[PDB]
Structure formats: C-alpha cells, structure tokens
C-alpha cells in the first residue's frame with residue numbers, strides 16, 4: 606500500500622521507478638517488488654520530507670538525490686531498467702554511511718541468497734576508520750523480470766586518501782585474483798570507482814573506472830581495443846573542441862589473461878549541452894543509428910519528470926557505449942531523479 610507520501614523522498618522516487626517499470630515492460634508484481642525494494646534500500650531516507658535539504662551532498666547525483674536511473678538499450682529490444690542507490694545516505698558522516706551501505710548489501714545477500722565473501726575480502730581497503738571522500742558505498746540493482754534483481758556494489762579507491770588511490774585499487778585487484786588487470790588500464794586522471802558483481806559467481810568479476818579530464822575521440826578509440834564505433838559515439842555525444850571529460854570502464858570477468866572482456870565509454874553529456882533537449886537529441890540519434898528503442902528513451906524521460914526538456918540540463922546525466930566480447934554493443938542512458946533541484950539551462 607506504500608507508507609510513503611509524494612512529499613517524501615521515497616514517495617517521489619518510488620513513483621518515478623513505478624513509471625519506469627512500465628517503460629521497461631515489467632509486470633505489476635515485479636513492479637511492486639522493485640518499488641518496495643527501492644524504498645527499503647533507502648532506509649530512513651525514504652520517509653524524509655523533500656522540504657528538508659538532502660542529508661548528504663552526495664556525488665551520486667548533481668542535486669544530491671541518492672537515487673539515479675539507467676536504461677540499457679540492446680538492438681531490437683525493450684530497454685533493461687537499473688537503479689543506483691546510496692543506502693547509507695541518511696547518515697551523518699562517511700563512516701556511518703558506509704556501515705549502513707554494507708548493512709543494506711548484507712540484507713540483500715540474505716534475501717537473494719548470494720555470498721559477500723568477495724566483498725568481505727576488501728573491507729579494510731574501502732571502509733577504513735576515518736574514510737576520505739567522496740562516497741562510501743553505492744548499489745546498482747538491475748530490475749530483471751522475476752523480481753530477483755542483479756546486484757552490483759560500487760566502492761571508493763580514494764577511501765584511504767587520494768595519495769593511496771592506486772595503491773588501494775592495486776591491492777583490491779590482487780586480493781580478488783586479478784593480478785594483471787591493473788596493467789591493462791589506460792593512463793588516467795582518477796580511479797573514481799571500483800564495481801564488484803554480487804551473485805552466483807565463483808570468481809570475482811570487477812569493473813575499474815578511469816577518469817580522463819581531456820579525452821580525445823582518437824584516445825577513446827585507442828583505449829577501446831570497434832574503434833570506429835567508439836570514435837563516432839564520442840563525436841555524436843560530445844557534439845563535435847577536440848577534448849572532453851569522459852570516463853572509461855574496464856571489465857574483467859576472468860583472472861587468467863589480465864585482459865578485459867568489456868570496455869565502456871561513459872560521456873557526461875550534461876556537461877556538454879545547453880539543455881536536456883540537446884542531450885535527448887544526441888542520445889536518440891545514437892540509439893536510432895544502432896537499431897535501439899529510441900521511442901522508449903522518450904517515454905522514460907517523461908516517466909521521470911513532466912517538465913519540458915529545454916527547461917533545464919542534467920536530466921540526461923550520461924550516455925555510455927558498452928562493448929563486451931561476444932555480445933552486441935549496448936547503449937546506456939542515465940537519467941536523474943531531480944528530487945531536489947533542476948539545474949538551469951547553460
């Protein structure tokens with residue numbers, strides 16, 4: 606029945622998620638299961654009045670909503686729906702934030718019957734006593750038909766200080782058995798995120814993110830080793846100056862070769878466009894050129910907010926091109942909740 610009112614954070618985001626579930630074509634049962642899961646995952650945040658300031662100035666979204674949606678488009682298919690949440694957001698400092706995030710993961714592990722052993726292995730690296738910013742733990746839920754979601758956990762390589770970012774990432778990869786993966790990463794300006802798949806995997810599967818402050822189309826293509834696709838995507842999303850801030854993501858699904866199995870180019874389109882009309886236009890063009898469901902993109906944006914796209918920027922937060930050995934390319938669009946603020950047109 607939902608103990609939440611549209612004036613509370615959880616009311617707003619569960620309404621958004623519910624409408625997104627319809628775009629994703631999930632039935633009523635799975636929709637109910639997943640909106641409840643989102644409400645539960647926010648903890649006390651769910652009943653917080655939206656009149657109050659965000660408890661934490663999280664990096665998760667620009668207006669500090671501890672929720673963000675993404676839609677993963679494969680050619681010829683309805684998009685798959687995922688949600689990113691910060692379970693410890695309604696806490697007073699980074700240590701408690703991380704304690705509460707871990708507590709949320711453990712409850713998910715219990716409910717859905719997977720092990721946290723590979724996460725537990727890393728706890729001293731990512732949850733020290735006096736953690737540094739900018740976040741402690743996020744969780745992404747892939748909202749799969751059947752009501753049992755895929756779970757991923759995001760961890761901060763800077764948790765023990767900016768000077769220990771590489772040392773912490775390297776030690777984590779070593780402990781997970783990926784002793785050659787670090788050598789496969791491109792040059793970078795930051796290692797902002799480490800993502801670990803949680804589920805039925807007898808060997809760890811990890812995603813290493815790299816920030817590139819001044820990435821060129823050609824460097825994007827070089828790092829993706831497929832190159833033409835990546836450079837074309839760069840221009841279309843970038844709207845092209847010859848460099849842009851972007852992130853690359855490098856997925857390692859085996860501990861044997863030291864080679865990644867996945868490459869993702871993540872482009873923060875919201876930093877390049879005047880307003881969300883321009884950002885939707887670029888995302889829709891990319892989807893159309895790949896045979897993906899560009900009409901569903903429009904319905905998903907309307908499911909999140911009725912506002913006109915040109916009235917702000919940042920609703921389309923990111924567009925990403927995902928390459929995975931053996932699979933079709935995928936395009937992911939990240940969509941903001943705007944529960945606290947709409948950023949004004951640029």
Ligand SMILES: Cc1ccc2[nH]cc(C[C@H](N)C(=O)O)c2c1
Pocket residue numbers: 664665666667673689814852871873922923939
């Ligand atoms: C690479 C990437 C792709 C999709 C994302 N959704 C939320 C974040 C975190 C933060 N808002 C940021 O922009 O880093 C993020 C990061």
Ligand SMILES: CC(C)=CCSP(=O)(O)OP(=O)(O)O
Pocket residue numbers: 689745759798800812854869927937
């Ligand atoms: C949300 C954050 C921090 C990064 C982008 S989420 P992701 O790249 O892991 O998306 P998938 O692994 O493709 O599901």
